[PDB]
Amino acid sequence: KSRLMGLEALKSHIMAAKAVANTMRTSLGPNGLDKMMVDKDGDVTVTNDGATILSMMDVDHQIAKLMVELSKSQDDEIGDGTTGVVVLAGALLEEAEQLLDRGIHPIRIADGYEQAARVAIEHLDKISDSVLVDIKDTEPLIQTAKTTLGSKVVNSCHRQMAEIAVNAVLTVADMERRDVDFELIKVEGKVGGRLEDTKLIKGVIVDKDFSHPQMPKKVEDAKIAILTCPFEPPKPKTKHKLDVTSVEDYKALQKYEKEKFEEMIQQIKETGANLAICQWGFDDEANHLLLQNNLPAVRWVGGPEIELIAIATGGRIVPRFSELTAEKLGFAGLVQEISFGTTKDKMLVIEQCKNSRAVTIFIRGGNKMIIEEAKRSLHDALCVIRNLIRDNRVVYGGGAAEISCALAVSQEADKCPTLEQYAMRAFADALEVIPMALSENSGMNPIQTMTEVRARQVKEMNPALGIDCLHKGTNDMKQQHVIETLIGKKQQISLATQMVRMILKIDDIRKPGESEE
Template identity: 70%
Template sequence: MSMFPGTVAFDEFGRPFIILRDQENQKRLTGIDALKSHIQAARQIASILRTSLGPRGLDKMMVSSDGEVTVTNDGATILKLMDVEHQIGKLMVQLAQSQDDEIGDGTTGVVVLAGALLEQASNLIDKGIHPIRIADGFEMAAAAALTHLDGISEAFPVNKNTRENLIKVAMTTLGSKVVVKCHRLMAEIAVDAILSVADLEKRDVNFELIKVEGKVGGRMEDSMLVRGVVIDKTMSHPQMPKVLKDVKLAILTCAFEPPKPKTKHKLHVGSAEEYRDLRKYEHEKFLEMVKRVKDAGANLAICQWGFDDEANHLLLAEQLPAVRWVGGPEMELIAIATGGRIVPRFEELTPDKLGSCGLVRELTFGTSKDEMLVIEQCSNSRAVTVLVRGGNRMIVEEAKRSVHDALCIVRSLVQDSRVVYGGGAAEVSCSLAVARAADKLSSLDQYSYRAFADALESVPLALAENSGLSPIDTLSEVKARQAAENNSNLGVDCMGHGSNDMKAMNVIESLHSKKQQIALATQLVKMILKIDDVRSPADGIQ
């Protein structure tokens, strides 16, 4: 009996079974074991993302449960599509998501940094330092790093004349993405889009006015910025004109169809005469609708709902071009761009509710003859559309994600126009500063400071590793040169250009983005270090 960690009981049929002692506690981790398990889970996720950091980072292929394939190296997207079971893993997913929502770029870097901080914390716990002391030390070290970042940042004026500088920053963001082969073009599109909608006095960018539309087919170089709205629709009838000038648009959410009985009652038509009367009535009603639209002065109808072939033919006969099945968000964007009002009933259509624009034309693409409608020269010229092209759906989707990152980073420059230098230069500089601060401390916190300094080095290490360089050699050389020359612009030469000066190489990053990465990673690590027990609803209280 002593073999068993429990007692034997017998069921009603006399069969023995074992009652295990402390069975309900077996699966629960508490204290240091729980912390170690959490740190392990977070480090695993960070190690997955680590290889996709930087301009030479690798992509990940995510296959969903229904076989849909996504290829990306955008940290937030990878984590969102990963099926993460572990609770701490889910916190890492939220970390990348909050970086994406706040800044839009740097999602991989923030997870790698959090993983490195937890790795260092694990070593400190092994040395016997209490997790709370580590967390507080990290927080103080992060504050020192953020202050240092402010010190090494450079002012970066943002206005209509500094377009070239903004393009350099956007190119840094796009350097690690799939779109790198038409690097410059994508950066120009992103910068021009932001400058079109930015309010430089208030330092604000209304993202609602920028729409990123993807269309499969053509080359990535065919992507363009349309100063207006692009909708993936065509004129409802092939014989309607393909180009319209000086357009007045009626934006309708009412159905362009003859009236139907809305009740449950059925309409019985007893004779051919009655049928003719009904048809005549429908015809007249429909012509009345068209007349209403034309009387208001509209020469193009944008309709949220469809209309049948008869209605389509009558619209053509009445020379009123129309577009059907336009989605809600597009309707709103068209209304903003053209200064029109969305009209829910024909009775309410008046000339002052019409939108106006200079040109509406159909774009035809390549051999597949795909068509889209472009509304340009709008009265509110601030609404723009980025049209992304690519050989297949995966490339178009990844290019859209990349353009989104570039748009976000240019937006954060409009809001806070200071910059630091990339390629791990800012991290190495902060690491040196935090290590210097550690030397001045006599308390236990100096261990946390040094660990934080080591964790900051994980970013340049990963950059060097992904670029095929010897990580330790490269990092020690950059650190030694930064310390000797007191030059915080020196980083990892990922692209093999033969120069470590990131300022000369135009590898520029937004200060706001870098500060947010360090702050968010530290916050998450502090939270994880304070969790020493995980209970699920089944555990109950023993």
């Protein structure tokens, strides 16, 4: 394979990282244009989501993989900003081209963009740095859960999607701890529901329901029998697995497990837990007994879920039918199958008003991508919300900060006598793609559209007013409720400039060609 260096490896790096940004900047914002993306699997995926694009994107040019990475970083913490850091990369990338074309050295270029990004993220700090509690944040959360859920296509008619998030990070993680638990928040979703169907569950909803509703559909508080024991074949790891074809062993077996499962179920009734959750759950033969025992109990359970039933409920663990004791009883506030008005949607909420260690934010919708649309809605909404519920620090978007950032950077670039005086000012240049593509996403001529914000920032010198992000005709950011976590732009910037900077620091490419995986 071959060594590729300098302008060669430069224009190597330049192609996709620039080229990939294009579909994503056409996808930039809600006015960002969708993309039908079809696998070799026969699949079809219509995505204006760059984070989903990058996921959908298997394309070559390892840098084009590194963006699939870089969006996911900002995807969890900041939420939104997955796509912009990508389209900002290609901006400052081509922006970097002509400085080398000028003769500005590859390590001259990157650092001029880099320290100028410091001013940017520093200038970012001037927009709104506020910090409030959850119950106050919900207003700037839902105003942003407008944008987030909405830039995710229909926040519309939902504070149900908005304000369960206000609870989501809140319950799983503190305000001040700022330790990211979207891992503790269970984002659950079900097709056949509605976007108008969205639910917060501080406990765990287990889709498996009572063996029979003829048996009680309400188990009392706790008294959950934690059981890893077969009431159906427990995929047991030891033996050769064969069913019997003869009536002789057909009768000899059917009397066997009617004895044990009943006295198992009675032993469960004996353990004093009137719900039996069984990590190896219920076939019908045990359920007739279970029904005949009149014991409310749970059929097949996912292996880690009965554990997740433990933690999320604070449930004390009864490991196995051999360990049985009446003392340890799993936690459930109320054990019942939940039909939401969507009856095809039936889960058994283990609903913890006492110990809730996994908060299920459960959203619904008509179909797969719909709930997925609503999930990545509910995902990044809360993710942007998580910033704002922790530190509610808001920049108003759509290029209103860009000029604002590009302004200070530009002059301060000239103020720096270093060669990067150009690069730092060249830095402030490529910031303008943010209103630019958005302008053309919103369907406006950016070059004028953006300097509106400039003329605004020339006057305003802050994101408040802006251009249309939603193509609504009121050119605003604050007032258009274009509200972006001030953390995230600092995130988003630092992500772009530094990833590119190493892309700029790496000029030395051993590949069979310009790009590779």
